[PDB]
Every structure is written in structure tokens, then in C-alpha cells.
Design a protein around this ligand. Structure first.
Ligand code: CHL
Ligand code: CLA
Ligand code: CLA
Ligand code: CLA
Ligand code: CLA
Ligand code: CLA
Ligand code: CLA
Ligand code: CLA
Ligand SMILES: CC(/C=C/C=C(C)/C=C/[C@@]12O[C@]1(C)C[C@@H](O)CC2(C)C)=C\C=C\C=C(C)\C=C\C=C(C)\C=C\[C@@]12O[C@]1(C)C[C@@H](O)CC2(C)C
Ligand SMILES: CC1=C(/C=C/C(C)=C/C=C/C(C)=C\C=C\C=C(C)\C=C\C=C(C)\C=C\C2=C(C)CCCC2(C)C)C(C)(C)CCC1
Lengths: 74, 182, 150, 39, 193, 202, 182
């Protein structure tokens, strides 16, 4: 607030939630570009269920007009 | 000879145990009830992983097989020959086989009778000298098999091929070109 | 880059946040002569504010779609953001705490200790103050020795 | 002045002579090193 | 022998390198003082060594005898991986330091009946195979060993700081000064300390 | 606390104790007190002789080949520019053989310093031995073949040595500034000594 | 005759040992238990490196070849004759050959005989001693030479008998001082 008040929002302390952003990546959201588990196309976890339900899943997680694992910031 | 020079060996490991070099810092075998259990399971892990290694060396040792690429077929394939089926049939007749024979352990280290036909265990004065060698070939294998799994996840390669890669370029290709430590 | 967020050295929004703030102060500075007092302040602030933006671009922080610098708090691109400072605190806080410990114990054995919490023995405290410089080396040795816990 | 110094070494006085010090220190450092988000 | 003549030496040094220095009173605990004495001893030996391989190279380079790089830029070079080198080093030292550590815990410990004539001597001074020539009435060596050590410990910290400040070799820094001592200083550079 | 009636270097001043007039050439000079501990006098006493006899040899090696080469006799050069490159072997070997032959003789002499009668007899032609001197630094036999038996004599050694040691320091110093042979430095000094001091030349 | 004139020989080396000239300044043999070991392992080093030297000379003077350039073929070549097998075939049938025969040398003798003295050199009486000096002094000398053979070639020079030749042409010119000093 004080930084906002003095007209210097660039001085804010904004910590990015790296840990949740990691989890979302492991779940297959590709925004953050960590490439883990269900993000990475060369992972056993991906190759196992890719012809099961993941196409319906991954399609839904990455539609950001829906509520499923919303985008996260400071 | 204990595992760390100087150090005093704890009260609970009598050195009349086979291969006691005084290693239980975490003091997991403090209680003798819980110790007798681990003395048993040690020997079994020891015994399996000794076959486990011996086995998954012999596979790729003389033939273009590999222990990581063995299950591919899920037609099985022993020593170049065909096979007697599939998945369900092996599971069933491995479940019952194992479940029965391990079920009937009403836990022993040296059950003998059937398991020593040729008759080595016998002559008290050397009986112990084997049980050391038992557990040390036991441990050395359990380490090696972990060594076989660790190197596989880093590379693709495969035990005897990794050994051959290291002999070509020893200084070059070793364990600081993967990621256990960066 | 990390979490897909851009670096402040490159990002457009961040560089347009530069412009807006500066061009707020240059709309003020018009209403004063150049020789005047407040003109030297609205120039000096600008110089400082324009220097500030430059010094995060050189620092290389990650700026988002917002235009604001976000921070990284785990591992090594962005150590100095949190990982170094973090120790800074645990030191100086540990410093304060252990000095305070050595004071209360040093008083404890002296008939009425409660007087020394109020009329503080300054020349006791100012000796413990400096002693409390090497505190983690003492704090460890005290955890070892086994005088640390009741 | 043994008495006057004991008063100057009273809790509320020390606190204030301590805080104007560690306040200045932090205002001072924010002058010559202005606007830190690193170091 | 005192480090500041007039300053009352703290009690816990009753003259057992002892010039009475321990202001913050680290070694008041005689546990801590025995441990800290060998920290010093190890810190000295490494640094005397290390600096010898910064200076004696660095001095001969100007002399012309050896075409050695500067100590910052002797890392970077092709033979083996550094990962390997560190690993093999970290492996090899870890073994031996563990033999020091058990000696520091249980002095004799390194003489178990089971290849160990490297029993011990006194604490921090192992001798025997570590003393080929064998030297043992004049144990003044024991003294220089700490002193020449603290000198060298400082010398390195100096190297590290005085390249951070001028960005040039200690054998250069030594000349630059010797050429105009009063205009090339501590006081005529980047940072005031 | 200090001898009264023996050679001084500041007449009236005090010899300290440890300089008894025992060693050869003691007039009791040790301002910095380097000979305090009688262990360390034992080394230095010997150290002096070695350093002395190398200088006295060396300074003769330096001067004579100039004294002759100017009279004109057959090889004569500059005592520093001499060792540059002009010999039947290379630099490298001449050192190797030198370092070998010495390493032998010196560890022989050193054992005699450590234990006074340890090395006094041939170990090959074992009937051949140098006599029971009992005097390290003054070993005798072969080494005294014409047989000068005296305190007289052992002064004259260290006095000549102290003088020679300098003369050599001079040679280093004098060369390093002036840049010619020390007999050429003495020629130019003798031509106009007054206008050619150090202070003149500095 | 002891190794350094003057010096007294330590308490632990009885001179009834073969070749004891009183060398243990680092006092590694102080403890008898650890002396009996090294007296053993001195003789074995002594032996091998005697053959070792004898062998890797012979390959350059007579047999056509060099001991440094010998393993090049990793087809083997004995005297001229293309030896059988390759590498693997030699590992297996050198492991088992050595491992067995050394592994049965422990279960601590320096001078066994029986098989190993068929002619009967040591035996009664005086002679047996006098040979064991000669045994260890040809043993040492050959351990020193082999290190001479590695040192001169290790990082410089060429072939043992060739290096000897090079020295005989130019002795004041080519010796140790070319790559040993610089
Ligand atoms: C223990 C003390 C130690 C110290 C103080 C250094 C210090 C240094 N090393 Mg060295 N190293 C040390 C141990 C080791 N280094 C290496 C392997 C390397 C490598 C491979 C490199 C360095 C490099 C560097 C330099 C990094 C540049 C810098 O900070 O710019 C101020 C720096 C002078 C770098 C270098 O030489 O850059 C010029 C480099 O790339 N070091 C090994 C072997 C694994 C070490 C083992 O103990
Ligand atoms: C070199 C390896 C090694 C050694 C030295 C021993 C030694 C021993 N085993 Mg064997 N054992 C081994 C491998 C080894 N085992 C392996 C790999 C397995 C798993 C198949 C077993 C499984 C096993 C069983 C189940 C039994 C033995 C038994 C014994 C003991 C008596 C019979 C004998 O000498 O064999 C003896 C101490 C028998 C015993 O103790 O009687 C016994 O019952 N062992
Ligand atoms: C039991 C003994 C044993 C032996 C003789 C070997 C031998 C070998 N291992 Mg190792 N290995 C072992 C246990 C063993 N391993 C264990 C206990 C682990 C777990 C940490 C590993 C984990 C491991 C890794 C991760 C790698 C090797 C690799 C190798 C080869 C190269 C050396 C290296 O970089 O490491 C070498 C043939 C390296 C390879 O395959 O190349 C390699 O990458 N090993
Ligand atoms: C010498 C000064 C001193 C020291 C070394 C400590 C030390 C401690 N206090 Mg603190 N404490 C202090 C003064 C001090 N206190 C004072 C003056 C107050 C009153 C404002 C408190 C009120 C306080 C509370 C309310 C709590 C602590 C707690 C603690 C512990 C955890 C750290 C923390 O939260 O703070 C720690 C052992 C926490 C704990 O017990 O854990 C906790 O809940 N303290
Ligand atoms: C612990 C002490 C120490 C350490 C860590 C190093 C480390 C190093 N030295 Mg060495 N050096 C040392 C002592 C030490 N030196 C000493 C005592 C001397 C003799 C006085 C030298 C003289 C020396 C030379 C002449 C050279 C090195 C070189 C090197 C580097 C090459 C790696 C290697 O030698 O293998 C490496 C950074 C080499 C280099 O520059 O690369 C090189 O040319 N060193
Ligand atoms: C139970 C398994 C086990 C474990 C966890 C360890 C662990 C350790 N041993 Mg080992 N050791 C073991 C079995 C084990 N040992 C056995 C069975 C023996 C007898 C053959 C030894 C004989 C042994 C010696 C002789 C030494 C170690 C040493 C060490 C330490 C080496 C650290 C290092 O090099 O870095 C380490 C803590 C070294 C040490 O730190 O001391 C050392 O000198 N060990
Ligand atoms: C260990 C003793 C030692 C010695 C003999 C020297 C000697 C020297 N240092 Mg110094 N230096 C030392 C320790 C030492 N340093 C230490 C411990 C530090 C860390 C604070 C420094 C930091 C330092 C700096 C920052 C500079 C020197 C510089 C110099 C040279 C000029 C004198 C000066 O500025 O100071 C001189 C050759 C100056 C130079 O190179 O010019 C210079 O700029 N040194
Ligand atoms: C066992 C006795 C022995 C004998 C008779 C020789 C004989 C010889 N060696 Mg030597 N050598 C020996 C032991 C021996 N060596 C040992 C123990 C070492 C280790 C320090 C060396 C290291 C060595 C080197 C490094 C070199 C020789 C070389 C030589 C030859 C020239 C002399 C020289 O440079 O030295 C000469 C034929 C030189 C050569 O081959 O030319 C040469 O460069 N030797
Ligand atoms: C300064 C230092 C220690 C300082 C600590 C001090 C002042 C302690 C003092 C006090 O505790 C007392 C007594 C009492 C307390 O009440 C107060 C304080 C005041 C706290 C250690 C340095 C120690 C310095 C060391 C050990 C450095 C060694 C050097 C090495 C090995 C480097 C390696 C290389 O340089 C080579 C050799 C060759 C190059 O080419 C490449 C590389 C790889 C860079
Ligand atoms: C690294 C990092 C991280 C993480 C962390 C963690 C995970 C942690 C944990 C931690 C823990 C898990 C802890 C524990 C603890 C315990 C205890 C038990 C404690 C104790 C204490 C004490 C005892 C104290 C004392 C004192 C002193 C010393 C001084 C002052 C005074 C007093 C008294 C207070 C993060 C990511 C965040 C960030 C980055 C970095």
C-alpha cells in the first residue's frame, strides 16, 4: 500500500507463487513452462493415460475462461 | 572390524550376529523384538538381490537382451525359445506359487533340511564363516542392484553397456554428467 | 522465463511504467521556473525515479504482464531476491535474541533481577552487544555443550 | 550524577536513545542506497 | 606475549599462538577451544600452501621462469570434466578428513589392531608418516606454523578483496604501489573500507 | 651478564652473555639478538663458515679471471654474462651432476654436524679415514693434508669470510646499478674517486 | 652394513630379517603385527618386478616390440606367434588363474617351497640365508628399475633399451635434466 500511495508500485514486494504454479504444471497447465509430468510430452505419466481421459482433461485445464485451476500471481 | 574406525559399537548388536560391523546410528534395532525381524529380512533381501543381479547380468551378458527392455512384450522369450503365455496365466501361477511357499514360513534364516542337501551347514566351526560370506555377498548385491536402477534412470544404457562406456572414456563418462548432484 | 514471466530488462509494460511516472512529473515541472527550489526536487526525483527503473533492469528481476517486478523464492538466476537476505535476518534477529538471552541469564543470579530489566546495566549490555556478534558459533557450541535447554 | 545516569539508563529512556539510533541507521542507509528490492 | 598491551587478557587463556586474542570470547568453553585450535591449524596449512601456489608462480611469471596464468584464471583447459575432478576430490578428501575427525573425537582411534601405525602424537600434530624428515629441544616450529599461517590466511582474504577492487594480479598490485606508493592505495580506488 | 675483557665492536658497550668468546671471531656483535638460544648459535656458527667459504672461493672466481684477462691471457668474459650459453654440456645437466655430487657430500657433512664422529671414515676403502677431529665445520685429515694444526688460524678464516661475503653482496649490488665488472667499477673509481662516489652515481 | 653411516638401527628390525639395513625412519614397521605383513609384501613386490623387468627388457632386445606399445591391439602377438583369444577371454582366464592361486596363498609364508623348490636350493643350511639377502636385493633393485622404466617413459623419453642407447651416444647431452628440471 505505501509504495502504491507514493506512486511507486514497481517497488512492491510481489512474490510469485512458484510452488502452486509448479503443481498446476504437473497437472498439465502449460502457461508457466516448467514442463513437468502432465506438461512434458516425454513423461511416462503422460504416455500412460494420453489415450484415456487426458485429452478431455488438458483441454479443460488450459481453457482459462473456466474456473479449473485458475491462473495465479502475487 | 567395525564400519567407522574409533567409534564404539552399540549394546544391541552382539557381533555373534553375522556381519555386525556396528552400523545402527538411527538405532532402528535398539529393541531386540524389532532386531530379530531385521536380521531375518536383511538375509532375504540379501538372497533375492543376489539372484536379482546374477540374473539381470546373464540376460544381456551373452545375448542382445536387457533387464530394463525385458517386459517389452506386455510373447515372452527365454534363452531365444518361445513361451507358455501371457500375463494373467503368469500372475496367477506366480501369486499361488509365491503366496503358498512364503505363506508357509511359520521366519527362519537357515531352515536347512531340504534347502541344504549337499551338506555344508554342518561342522559348527566353519558354519559361521559362510554366514558372514552369505550376508556380505547379500549386501554387495543389494547395493549393486540399486546401482543398476540408479544408472538406468540417468542414462538409457544398461549395466554391462554402461561398464563398457566407462572403460572407453572413464574420465569423460561417469556420474557427474547426469544430475544426482549438478 | 521462470513461470513464463518476462525479464524487466526487456519487458514493454515495465518500460511504459517508466514513461507514465516520469511524464507525470514533467507535467508538474512546467508550472515552475528552472532556477526555482521545487524544480530542483521535481528534477532530482525524476533522476532518482529514472535511475531506480534502470537499477532493476541491471539487477535483472522478472516483470509480468502487469509491468511490476515479481520475485523468486526457492533456488540460480534470482538468489539475491530472497535466498541471501533471508540469512541477513536470521543472523541479526538471532543476534538480538542471543544478546537478550545472555543479558537475562547474566542478571538472573543477583538477589533482585527485576531491577536490571528496568534500570538496565548499560555497560553489561554493551559488552554482551559486541559478544553477540559471533553468536551462531556460540549458539551451536551451547546446543552441543548441553546448557541450552531446561 | 550516579542518580542522573541511572535515570538515563531507565527502560523508556534507553529504548528511545536506542530507537532514534536504529531508525536513523535505516533512514541513512535508504539515502545513499535509495530504493532497494535486492541487497 | 599480548596482542594489545594493557587490555586484560580473558581468564580462559592461562598460556596453554596464544597472544591473548579472543574479544567475543568464543573459546571460553574449553570444548570449543580444542575444536577451534585445529580449525586454525588446518586453515593455516591449506592457506600457506594455496598462497605459495599464487605468489611463487605469480612472482616467477614476472621473473620470466614460468608462463603461469593469474590465480583467478587458472580454473578455465581441456583434459577431464570438473564434475569428475570435484567428485574424485570430494570423494578422496572426505575419506581422509573422516580419519582426522575420528582422531579429533578419539585421539588414538586411528591405530586399531585390525594397517594403522598412523596412531597419533598430540592433538592437531599427527607426525610419524606426516613427518618424513622427523623434527622434535626446539619446538619453536610449532609457533611459526600458526604465525606464518595467520599471515597467509590474511594474505588470501587480501588477494580476494584486492582483485574485487583493482581487478589485477597481486604481483601487479605490488608493483603499481611500489611505482607510486602515495597515489596508488587502499585510498585511491572503488571502495573506502 | 656479558664478558668484560674481550674484543668489542663498540668499545665501552656491552657484549651480551651468550657470545662468550667461545666461537671463532666472536667480538660479541648481535644487536638484534639472533644468537640468544644456544641451539640456534650451533646452526648459525656453521651456516657462517659455509656461507663464508663459498663467498671467499666465489669472490676469487670473480676477481682473478678479470685480473688475468686484463693482463691478457685463454678465456675471459663478464662474471654474470659468463654463464649465458658457451659450454660442452647444456645448462640442465651441469646442474643435475652438480646437484647429485653435492647432495652426497652435504648429507655426509650434515650427519657429522648432527653426531660429531658419525662420518670420519671411508665406506669403500674402509682402512682410509680422516682423524678423530670431533669438530664439525673443522673436520681435518685429507682436508688438512699439508697439516696446519690454532685459534689464530680459525679467526683468520671467518674474518676473511665476513669480508668476502660482503665483497660478493657488493658484486651483486655494484653490477645491478653500474652494469660492468667490479675491477672496471674500481678502475673508474680510481680515475676520479671524488666525482665517483655512490652519491655521485645516485 | 646399515643404510646411513652414523645412524642407529631401530629396536624393531632384528637384522636376522633378510636385507635389513635399518631403514624405517617413518617407523611404519614399529608394530610387529604390521611388520610381518610388510616383510611378506616386500618379497612379493621383490619377486614380480624381477620378472616384470626381465620380461619388458626381453620384448625390445630379442622379441620384436616395446612394453609401452605392447597392448596396442586393444590380435595378440607372442614372440611373433598370433596368440589365441582377444581381451574378454584373457580377463576371465587371468582372474580365475590369479584369484584361485593367490586366494589359496593366504589360507602367510615368504619361503614356502615344496612344489616351488623342486631342485632344493634352500634347504640345509647356511646357503638358505645367504640366498634370501640376494632374493630381496635383486628384489629391490628390480622394483627400483621398473619405476626407473616408468619414470623415464612415464611422461617423457621412449624405450628402456633405446633410452640407454640415446644416453650412450650423448651422455652429457641426453639424461634426466631435459624434462626433469626445466
Ligand atoms: C577451494 C577453493 C577454491 C576457490 C576459492 C576457487 C576459486 C575460483 N575458481 Mg576454482 N576455486 C576453488 C576450488 C576449485 N575450483 C575448481 C574448479 C574450477 C573451475 C572448473 C573453474 C573454477 C573457477 C574459479 C573462479 C570463479 C570466478 C570468480 O569468482 O570470478 C571472480 C574462482 C577464482 C572458474 C575459472 O577459472 O574462471 C576464470 C572455473 O570455470 N574453479 C575445483 C576442481 C573441481 C576446485 C576444487 O576444490
Ligand atoms: C555365496 C553365496 C551364498 C552363501 C555363501 C550361502 C551360504 C549358506 N546358505 Mg544360501 N543362499 C544364497 C547364497 C549363498 N548362501 C542365495 C543367493 C539364496 C537365495 C536363493 C540363498 C538361499 C538359501 C536358503 C533358503 C538356505 C540357504 C542356506 C545356506 C547355509 C547352508 C547351506 C549352504 O552352505 O549353502 C549357508 C550359510 C540353507 C541353510 O541355512 O541351511 C538354507 O536353508 N541359502
Ligand atoms: C556395488 C558397487 C558398484 C559398482 C562397482 C559400480 C560401478 C559403476 N557405476 Mg555405480 N552405483 C552403485 C554401485 C556400484 N556402481 C550404487 C550403490 C549407486 C547408487 C548411488 C550407483 C549409481 C550409479 C550411477 C548413477 C551411475 C553409476 C555408474 C557406474 C559406472 C561408472 C562409475 C560412476 O560414474 O559411478 C561403474 C561401472 C554410471 C554410469 O552408468 O555411467 C552412472 O551414471 N552408478
Ligand atoms: C530476550 C528476548 C526474547 C527472546 C529471546 C524470546 C524468544 C522467543 N519468543 Mg518471545 N517475547 C519477548 C522477548 C523474547 N522472546 C517479549 C519481550 C515478548 C512480549 C512482547 C515476547 C512475546 C512472545 C510471544 C507471545 C511468543 C514468543 C515466542 C518466542 C519463541 C519463538 C520466537 C518468536 O515468535 O518470537 C522464542 C523462544 C513464541 C513461542 O513461545 O514460540 C510466542 O508465541 N515471545
Ligand atoms: C592446495 C594447494 C594448491 C592448489 C589447490 C592448486 C591448484 C592449481 N594449481 Mg597449483 N601450485 C601449488 C599449490 C596448489 N595449486 C604449489 C604449492 C605450487 C608450487 C609453489 C603450485 C604451482 C603451480 C603451477 C606452476 C601451476 C599450478 C597449476 C594449478 C592449477 C591446475 C590443476 C593442477 O595442478 O592439477 C590449479 C588451479 C597450473 C595452472 O596454472 O593451471 C600451473 O601451471 N600450480
Ligand atoms: C553399513 C554400511 C557402511 C556405511 C554406511 C559406512 C560409512 C562410512 N564408512 Mg565404512 N565400512 C563399512 C560399512 C559402512 N561404512 C564396512 C562393512 C567396513 C569394513 C570393511 C568399513 C570400513 C571402513 C573404513 C576402514 C573407513 C570407513 C569409513 C566410512 C565413512 C567414509 C566417509 C567418506 O569417505 O566420505 C562413512 C561414514 C572411513 C572413515 O570415515 O573413517 C574409513 O576410514 N569404513
Ligand atoms: C596480508 C597482508 C597484506 C599485504 C602485505 C598487502 C599489501 C598490499 N595491499 Mg592489501 N589487503 C590485505 C592484505 C595485505 N595487502 C587484506 C587482508 C585486504 C582485505 C581488506 C587487503 C585489501 C587491499 C586492497 C583493497 C588494496 C590492497 C592493496 C595493497 C597494496 C597497497 C597497500 C594497500 O592498499 O593496502 C600492497 C602491495 C592496494 C593495491 O593493490 O593498490 C589495494 O587497492 N589491499
Ligand atoms: C635402478 C637403477 C637405474 C638405472 C641404472 C638407470 C639408468 C638410466 N636412467 Mg633412470 N631412473 C631410475 C633408476 C635407474 N635409472 C629411478 C629409480 C628413477 C625414478 C626417479 C629414474 C628416472 C629416470 C628418468 C626420468 C630418466 C632416467 C634416465 C635414465 C638413463 C639416463 C640417466 C638419467 O637421466 O638418470 C639411464 C640409462 C633418462 C633417460 O631415459 O634418458 C631419464 O630421462 N631415469
Ligand atoms: C582470513 C581467515 C580467517 C579469519 C578469521 C579471523 C580474523 C579470526 C579472528 C577471531 O576469532 C578470533 C581469533 C577471536 C574472536 O573473538 C574474534 C575474531 C576476530 C572473530 C581465513 C582464511 C583462509 C584462507 C584459505 C584457507 C585459502 C586457501 C587458498 C586456496 C586453497 C585457494 C585455491 C587456489 O588459489 C590456488 C591455490 C591456485 C589458484 O590458481 C586457484 C585457486 C583454486 C583459487
Ligand atoms: C531454505 C529455504 C526455504 C525453506 C525452508 C524450510 C523448509 C525450513 C524449515 C525449517 C525447520 C524445519 C525448522 C525447525 C526448527 C526447530 C527448532 C527446534 C528450533 C529451535 C530454535 C531455538 C532453540 C532458538 C534459540 C535461540 C537462539 C539460537 C538465538 C536467539 C534466542 C533463542 C533462545 C530464541 C524457503 C523455500 C522457505 C525459502 C528459500 C530458502
Amino acid at each position: 500500500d505505501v509504495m502504491q500511495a507514493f506512486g511507486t508500485p514497481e517497488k512492491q514486494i510481489l512474490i510469485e507463487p512458484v510452488f502452486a504454479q509448479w503443481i498446476q504444471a504437473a497437472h498439465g497447465k502449460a502457461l508457466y513452462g516448467f514442463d513437468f509430468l502432465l506438461s512434458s510430452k516425454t513423461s511416462a505419466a503422460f504416455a500412460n493415460g494420453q489415450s484415456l481421459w487426458l485429452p478431455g482433461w488438458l483441454d479443460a485445464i488450459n481453457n482459462n475462461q473456466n474456473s479449473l485451476f485458475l491462473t495465479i500471481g502475487p | 572390524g567395525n564400519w567407522l574406525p574409533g567409534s564404539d559399537a552399540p549394546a544391541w548388536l552382539p557381533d555373534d550376529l553375522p556381519g555386525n560391523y556396528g552400523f545402527d546410528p538411527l538405532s532402528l534395532g535398539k529393541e531386540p523384538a524389532s532386531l530379530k525381524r531385521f536380521t531375518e529380512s536383511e538375509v532375504i533381501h540379501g538372497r533375492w538381490a543376489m539372484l536379482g543381479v546374477a540374473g539381470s547380468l546373464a540376460v544381456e551378458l551373452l545375448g542382445y537382451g536387457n533387464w530394463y527392455d525385458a517386459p517389452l512384450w506386455a510373447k515372452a522369450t527365454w534363452f531365444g525359445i518361445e513361451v507358455p503365455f501371457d500375463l494373467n496365466a503368469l500372475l496367477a501361477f506366480e501369486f499361488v506359487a509365491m503366496a503358498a511357499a512364503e505363506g508357509q514360513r511359520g521366519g527362519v534364516v537357515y531352515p536347512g533340511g531340504a534347502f541344504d542337501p549337499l551338506g555344508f551347514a554342518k561342522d559348527s566351526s566353519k558354519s559361521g564363516e559362510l554366514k558372514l560370506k552369505e550376508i556380505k555377498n547379500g549386501r554387495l548385491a543389494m547395493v549393486a542392484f540399486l546401482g543398476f536402477v540408479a544408472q538406468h534412470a540417468a542414462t538409457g544404457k544398461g549395466p554391462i553397456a554402461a561398464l563398457g562406456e566407462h572403460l572407453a572414456n572413464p574420465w569423460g563418462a561417469n556420474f557427474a554428467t547426469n544430475g544426482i548432484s549438478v | 522465463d521462470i513461470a513464463g514471466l518476462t525479464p524487466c530488462s526487456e519487458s514493454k509494460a515495465y518500460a511504459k511504467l517508466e514513461k507514465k511516472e516520469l511524464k507525470t512529473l514533467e507535467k508538474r515541472l512546467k508550472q515552475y521556473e528552472a532556477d526555482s527550489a521545487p524544480a530542483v526536487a521535481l528534477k532530482a526525483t525524476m533522476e532518482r525515479t529514472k535511475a531506480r527503473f534502470a537499477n532493476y533492469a541491471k539487477a535483472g528481476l522478472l516483470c509480468g504482464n502487469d509491468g511490476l517486478p515479481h520475485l523468486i523464492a526457492d533456488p540460480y538466476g534470482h538468489a539475491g531476491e530472497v535466498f541471501i537476505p533471508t540469512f541477513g535476518f536470521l543472523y541479526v534477529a538471532g543476534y538480538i535474541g542471543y544478546v537478550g538471552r545472555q543479558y537475562l541469564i547474566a542478571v538472573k543470579g543477583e538477589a533482585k533481577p527485576t531491577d536490571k530489566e528496568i534500570i538496565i546495566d548499560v555497560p553489561l549490555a554493551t559488552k554482551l552487544a559486541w559478544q553477540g556478534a559471533g553468536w551462531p558459533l556460540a549458539a551451536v557450541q551451547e546446543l552441543q555443550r548441553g546448557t541450552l535447554l531446561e | 550524577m550516579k542518580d542522573f545516569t541511572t535515570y538515563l539508563s531507565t527502560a523508556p529512556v534507553i529504548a528511545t536513545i536506542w530507537f532514534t539510533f536504529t531508525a536513523g541507521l535505516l533512514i541513512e542507509i535508504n539515502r545513499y542506497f535509495p530504493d532497494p528490492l535486492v541487497f | 606475549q599480548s596482542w594489545l598491551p594493557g587490555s586484560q587478557i580473558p581468564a580462559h587463556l592461562d598460556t596453554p599462538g596464544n597472544f591473548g586474542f579472543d574479544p567475543l570470547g568464543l573459546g571460553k568453553d574449553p570444548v570449543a577451544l580444542r575444536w577451534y585450535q585445529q580449525a586454525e591449524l588446518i586453515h593455516c596449512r591449506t592457506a600457506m600452501a594455496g598462497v605459495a601456489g599464487i605468489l611463487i608462480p605469480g612472482l616467477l611469471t614476472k621473473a620470466g621462469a614460468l608462463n603461469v596464468p593469474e590465480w583467478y584464471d587458472a580454473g578455465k583447459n581441456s583434459f577431464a570434466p570438473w564434475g569428475s575432478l570435484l567428485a574424485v576430490q570430494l570423494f578422496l578428501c572426505g575419506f581422509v578428513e573422516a580419519k582426522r575427525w575420528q582422531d579429533i573425537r578419539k585421539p588414538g582411534s586411528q591405530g586399531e589392531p585390525g594397517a594403522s601405525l598412523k596412531g597419533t602424537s598430540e592433538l592437531g600434530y599427527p607426525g610419524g608418516p606426516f613427518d618424513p624428515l622427523g623434527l622434535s629441544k626446539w619446538a619453536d616450529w610449532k609457533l611459526k606454523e600458526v604465525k606464518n599461517g595467520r599471515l597467509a590466511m590474511l594474505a588470501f582474504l587480501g588477494f580476494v578483496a584486492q582483485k574485487y577492487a583493482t581487478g589485477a594480479g597481486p604481483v601487479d598490485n605490488l608493483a603499481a604501489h611500489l611505482k607510486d606508493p602515495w597515489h596508488v592505495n587502499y585510498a585511491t580506488n572503488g571502495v573506502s573500507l | 651478564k656479558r664478558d668484560a675483557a674481550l674484543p668489542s665492536w663498540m668499545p665501552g658497550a656491552d657484549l651480551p652473555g651468550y657470545l662468550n668468546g667461545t666461537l671463532p671471531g666472536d667480538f660479541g656483535f648481535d644487536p638484534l639478538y639472533l644468537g640468544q638460544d644456544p641451539v640456534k648459535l650451533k646452526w648459525y656458527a656453521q651456516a657462517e663458515l659455509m656461507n663464508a667459504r663459498f663467498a671467499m672461493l666465489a669472490v676469487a672466481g670473480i676477481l682473478v679471471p678479470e685480473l688475468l684477462s686484463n693482463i691478457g691471457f685463454g678465456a675471459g668474459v663478464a662474471w654474470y654474462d659468463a654463464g649465458k650459453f658457451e659450454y660442452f654440456a647444456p645448462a640442465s645437466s651441469l646442474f643435475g651432476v652438480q646437484m647429485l655430487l653435492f647432495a652426497w657430500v652435504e648429507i655426509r657433512r650434515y650427519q657429522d654436524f648432527v653426531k660429531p664422529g658419525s662420518a670420519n671414515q671411508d665406506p669403500i676403502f674402509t682402512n682410509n679415514k680422516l682423524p678423530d677431529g670431533n669438530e664439525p665445520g673443522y673436520p681435518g685429515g685429507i682436508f688438512d693434508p699439508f697439516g696446519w694444526s690454532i685459534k689464530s688460524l680459525k679467526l683468520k678464516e671467518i674474518k676473511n669470510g665476513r669480508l668476502a661475503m660482503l665483497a660478493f653482496a657488493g658484486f651483486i649490488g655494484q653490477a645491478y646499478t653500474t652494469g660492468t665488472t667490479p675491477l672496471k667499477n674500481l678502475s673508474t673509481h680510481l680515475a676520479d674517486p671524488w666525482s665517483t662516489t655512490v652519491w655521485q652515481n645516485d
